[PDB]
Design a protein around this ligand. Sequence first.
Ligand code: PRP
Ligand code: PRP
Lengths: 209, 209
Amino acid sequence: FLGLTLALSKGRILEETMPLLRAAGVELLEDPEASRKLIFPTSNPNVRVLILRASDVPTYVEHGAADFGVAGKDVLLEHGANHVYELLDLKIAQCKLMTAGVKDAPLPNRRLRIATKYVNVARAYFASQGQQVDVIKLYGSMELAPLVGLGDLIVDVVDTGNTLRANGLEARDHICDVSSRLIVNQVSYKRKFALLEPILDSFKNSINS
Amino acid sequence: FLGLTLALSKGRILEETMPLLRAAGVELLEDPEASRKLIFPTSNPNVRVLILRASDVPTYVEHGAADFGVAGKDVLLEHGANHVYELLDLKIAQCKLMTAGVKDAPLPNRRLRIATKYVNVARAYFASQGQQVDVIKLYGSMELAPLVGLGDLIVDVVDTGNTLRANGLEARDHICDVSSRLIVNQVSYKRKFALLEPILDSFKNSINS
Ligand SMILES: O=P(O)(O)OC[C@H]1O[C@H](OP(=O)(O)OP(=O)(O)O)[C@H](O)[C@@H]1O
Ligand SMILES: O=P(O)(O)OC[C@H]1O[C@H](OP(=O)(O)OP(=O)(O)O)[C@H](O)[C@@H]1O
């Protein structure tokens, strides 16, 4: 495939990216949410879309299996963004990385154990608080961990806070704001700039309003 | 909670475990597939169920956040089973760990790159073939990886083989057979044996027929 391959993920990233794509002249020809297919043509024959797990977007873009992609800052921080270029903050799929635990549970006076998917972000954040923590790696449902006593806190993304509230948890610390970012393969940026440029300019214009 | 906490995962593990549980006198009181809730009472007041991501079952059981659980051999091999006891092969959710690639694609004469979730299993398998491979860690949709040239092969579970066939891929090597296994926390095994024992005996009896 000679053109550009764009990496997206299902849910909020797909939904909130599509209007940027539309204004940039790119529209999907069916709903990826309703297909098991993974590669999708678009209204532009030079652009195709990969639908990936959010955690795999940086990986595909880094290796050049996608030329560019839309990834959450949370995923970028966790994966490491040293081998892609972060070109734009798209200001979509906004949320916060936070620490949380059982409401009014006292913290134990010992090395804390942090149940989380975000092991690198947990370690770096807690290091900034003077804290060398243990991490317990999980793949999902962080909110259960404090209810069964797995770790002392979690680190997870919080949007409305409804998940935390539904489970008797409250945010302890705000780590950072998260939004989806446009990332580009370091070589594709150089080799396919004439294809990327009008799309980047459109996105940038769109984000201003 | 004084009783036993059982870790399960959604889909085939939940579906195929429920009959064993029923024969052991444990029935869920609603369908976990239709709830966002994670802890579930059962017909037995001494048994509750956690619904977890399959990859987190060994973790919860290891730490004692669950006393026992049902995990796929694939997950156990990848996570490491050195800090739980594998008590039974339940013979449910049967599948195979396999290597696969694009159909009739020749392997490149260099260090292979293996796109997979199963990074430890990929490295150990290929080591047995005299091969020190690079791994590219992914979280899902392994079948896409060879279609976009991310890695040379994948390692993933194969059941019917329909996923591979739908994507123009074929299995190259059979790594091992996979089935769901009953695992127990090493301390719970010792402290809660009188609760576990009749349930284990029931499962063992059930698996014989
Ligand atoms: O603060 P809230 O508005 O309750 O949202 C927080 C949830 O969002 C994230 O999940 P993600 O968005 O990846 O998928 P989900 O919302 O479908 O769980 C995260 O894992 C929390 O479960
Ligand atoms: O050989 P097949 O019968 O096509 O099945 C193989 C699929 O099964 C596994 O997924 P899992 O069972 O975890 O969930 P899924 O089947 O819903 O993808 C694996 O990740 C493959 O995608």
